[PDB]
Amino acid sequence: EKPAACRCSRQDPKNRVNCGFPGITSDQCFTSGCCFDSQVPGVPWCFKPLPAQESEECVMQVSARKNCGYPGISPEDCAARNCCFSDTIPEVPWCFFPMSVEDCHY
């Protein structure tokens, strides 16, 4: 397995949750469909990803979607000349800015 780097590196500042085991390495953590950072000492190094779209372009939790477009806009038209459009989760900004990074890692 292997999701992405933004799904690990750009995870969350303290999730108090893990998706691996104490003493892991990484690959084995990235092969279990889980992510691994460790960057944060003490907290859970091995955790889960942060998917939010069928395309590794959005990626973001209910809060990282800022709020590009409007909750009144629709699909197609959104991505038309707006930003990401993940309505998968109602009650949030579907039209949000793109990760616009790529400086993520494992």
Curated annotation (Swiss-Prot):
GO terms for molecular function: CXCR4 chemokine receptor binding; growth factor activity. Its main location: secreted. The keyword tRNA-binding does not apply. GO terms for biological process: chemokine-mediated signaling pathway; maintenance of gastrointestinal epithelium; negative regulation of gastric acid secretion. The keyword Signal applies. Disulfide bonds join 6-104, 8-35, 19-34, 29-46, 58-84, 68-83, 78-95. It is found in: Secreted. Found in pancreas. Keywords: Disulfide bond, Growth factor, Pyrrolidone carboxylic acid, Repeat, Secreted, Signal. Residues 6-50, 56-99 form the P-type domain. It comes from the Eukaryota. One of its GO terms (cellular component) is extracellular space. Inhibits gastrointestinal motility and gastric acid secretion. Could function as a structural component of gastric mucus, possibly by stabilizing glycoproteins in the mucus gel through interactions with carbohydrate side chains. This is Trefoil factor 2. The chain holds residues 23 to 127 of 127 of the full protein.
